[PDB]
C-alpha cells in the first residue's frame, strides 16, 4: 500500500483518479 488504495499497481509513472 502507498497513499492511494492500490499503491501504483497499474502501468506506472504519474497515476490518476484520486477519489
Curated annotation (Swiss-Prot):
Lung, placenta and pancreas. Induction: TF expression is highly dependent upon cell type. TF can also be induced by the inflammatory mediators interleukin 1 and TNF-alpha, as well as by endotoxin, to appear on monocytes and vascular endothelial cells as a component of cellular immune response. A lipid is attached at residue 1 (S-palmitoyl cysteine). Residues 1-19 are cytoplasmic. It comes from the Eukaryota. Interacts with HSPE; the interaction, inhibited by heparin, promotes the generation of activated factor X and activates coagulation in the presence of activated factor VII. Initiates blood coagulation by forming a complex with circulating factor VII or VIIa. The [TF:VIIa] complex activates factors IX or X by specific limited proteolysis. TF plays a role in normal hemostasis by initiating the cell-surface assembly and propagation of the coagulation protease cascade. Belongs to the tissue factor family. This is Tissue factor. The lineage of its organism: Eukaryota, Metazoa, Chordata, Craniata, Vertebrata. The gene is F3. The chain holds residues 277 to 295 of 295 of the full protein.
Amino acid at each position: 500500500c502507498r497513499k492511494a488504495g492500490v499503491g501504483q499497481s497499474w502501468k506506472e509513472n504519474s497515476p490518476l483518479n484520486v477519489s
